[PDB]
Amino acid sequence: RIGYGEDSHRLEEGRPLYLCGLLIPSPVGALAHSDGDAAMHALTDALLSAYGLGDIGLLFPDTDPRWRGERSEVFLREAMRLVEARGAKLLQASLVLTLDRPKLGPHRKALVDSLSRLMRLPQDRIGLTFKTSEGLAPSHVQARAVVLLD
Amino acid sequence: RIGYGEDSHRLEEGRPLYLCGLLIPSPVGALAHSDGDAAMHALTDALLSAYGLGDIGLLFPDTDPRWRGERSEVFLREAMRLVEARGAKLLQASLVLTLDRPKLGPHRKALVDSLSRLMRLPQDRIGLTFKTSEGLAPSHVQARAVVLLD
Amino acid sequence: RIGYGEDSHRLEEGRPLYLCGLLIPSPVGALAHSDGDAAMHALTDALLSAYGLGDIGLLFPDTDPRWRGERSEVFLREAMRLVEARGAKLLQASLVLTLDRPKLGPHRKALVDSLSRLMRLPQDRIGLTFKTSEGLAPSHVQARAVVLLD
Ligand SMILES: Nc1ccn([C@@H]2O[C@H](COP(=O)(O)OP(=O)(O)O)[C@@H](O)[C@H]2O)c(=O)n1
Ligand SMILES: Nc1ccn([C@@H]2O[C@H](COP(=O)(O)OP(=O)(O)O)[C@@H](O)[C@H]2O)c(=O)n1
Ligand SMILES: Nc1ccn([C@@H]2O[C@H](COP(=O)(O)OP(=O)(O)O)[C@@H](O)[C@H]2O)c(=O)n1
Ligand SMILES: [Mg+2]
Ligand SMILES: [Mg+2]
Ligand SMILES: [Mg+2]
Ligand SMILES: [Mg+2]
Ligand SMILES: [Mg+2]
Ligand SMILES: [Mg+2]
Questions:
Q1: From the CA atom positions of chain C, what is the Rg in Å?
Q2: GO:BP terms for this protein (chains A, B, C)?
Q3: Domains of chain C
Q4: How many pairs of residues across A and B have Cβ atoms under 8 Å apart?
Q5: Pick from A6, A7, B12, C8: most CB atoms within 10 A?
């Protein structure tokens, strides 16, 4: 099984930035009613997609007391709960984060270690890459992710 | 086998919106020489891609009287006829549609049913998710798709 | 195993265009430190990502002599050496190039042939499709790629 997911968020100056579950020191951060963690959301959508379960907006509406105000890792762990209850064994996740700043290079080990811990995947099964937007989307963070299971 | 495909169309007020082979009531719809069904186009290219067969511009150009003016489902079914003839068995389709409006949530069931029917896949093998552009592409519909075969 | 990668470059007039390892006749070429070959960069990142090896800015800084002024095929072949050393057997590459001009259709045979030879894959395992940006990115080339191994 395969799943494909995307997420993007507007970045504004002076707001905290959350990526792969971690607070990343930054001059910019998500402008959103969620934590804006685009890695988390895209991976979450990919996992749900792999089982045709819907998407994060359908399954994690903030109108719902269980998810409102919560950080995005909660949604990802619920998604993995759901797909595991359906027999899933997650094998791999490969994703690309697109943002002009900050540079994620300095945080690469922590970021990957986070994804590995949260999805209980060995680090060679976590493929994380970073790109700038080259001026195409200077004010956003974008994430696109593929997951493989079974 | 795997294939990856993309498509996008400009959206204009008062044009019909076609997605996943359906008419979706909308204030905006594709401006294009096709029906602008981004979902079908992406899926069609992903299928063709999985066998190296080309892209929809190569195989279904509107200078070819067979294809000009045809709905995009026609192209999708021909792409599966072509891969099937080369031995493929489609297994899974996971795709993301990005558009600010209209909301596709209230049409999710219809949309997933349509893909399921057109591709002859069980609904747990149709992974459809929806995103807004968060202001990046407010006048476009975008689609990105992965397919899995055998 | 699977991997996903992306790349983009600004395009300027009076600049050579390299794609899929080839110089393409074009009125615009990448504005970039590298040769700006978005297809090769995306494919390289996808390969690296399939083994959790990092990304092209991590493995190929210009600060390392080995890589300075080097054409992108050197990066791609380094990344296949690395996954090959880990027992990988590349099975397929499927990627989408997005750019308004120049038209890539007239060069489809050459482009696919180049990828086939560089990655040592049969042509039906090279899935290449082309898209315009429909107005969204008129001065950039973008590339998004999935690789499948074993
Ligand atoms: N055209 C659209 C776009 C999104 N959506 C749903 O709207 C939700 C929220 O989309 P969004 O782009 O604002 O997502 P987030 O900010 O929650 O990351 C999705 O998860 C999809 O459920 C929709 O029904 N129709
Ligand atoms: N730079 C490009 C862009 C597109 N193309 C071909 O041009 C066609 C039409 O591209 P488009 O972005 O206008 O696609 P559609 O409107 O048909 O969805 C493709 O399906 C590719 O065959 C090309 O050869 N070179
Ligand atoms: N926000 C970001 C963006 C890119 N990067 C690293 O920055 C490098 C160069 O990014 P780029 O978008 O300029 O890539 P290229 O021009 O080399 O194709 C990478 O390949 C990623 O290592 C980062 O650490 N943090
Ligand atoms: Mg989000
Ligand atoms: Mg750069
Ligand atoms: Mg189209
Ligand atoms: Mg067009
Ligand atoms: Mg939102
Ligand atoms: Mg590049």
A1: 15
A2: isopentenyl diphosphate biosynthetic process, methylerythritol 4-phosphate pathway; terpenoid biosynthetic process
A3: 1-150 (3.30.1330.50)
A4: 74
A5: A7
C-beta atoms of A6 and B108 within 8 A: no
Q: Which residue type is seen at C106?
A: P
List the resolution, Å.
Answer: 1.5
Structure tokens at C5: 């990668």
Could you give the CA distance from residue B55 to residue B41 in angstroms, rounded to a whole number? Answer: 9
- Give the technique used to solve this structure: X-ray
Contacts within 8 Å (CB) and 24+ apart, A65-72: A71/A18, A71/A21, A71/A35, A71/A37, A72/A18, A72/A21, A72/A34, A72/A35, A72/A37, A72/A40, A72/A41, A72/A44
Confirm whether residue C60 is marked as ligand binding: yes
The rounded Å distance from CA B6 to ligand 9 centre is 19
Interface test with B, best of C94, C136, C148 (most B CBs within 10 A): C94
Question: CA C128 to CA A132: how far, in whole Å?
Answer: 24
Mutate which: A55, A59, A86, A98, vs B, most B CBs within 10 A = A55
Q: Residue B99 annotated as binding?
A: yes
Q: CA-CA distance, B5 to C79, in Å (whole number)?
A: 24
Phi then psi for B126, rounded to 5 degrees? Answer: -110, 110
- Give the chain A residue whose CA is nearest to the CA of B143: A6
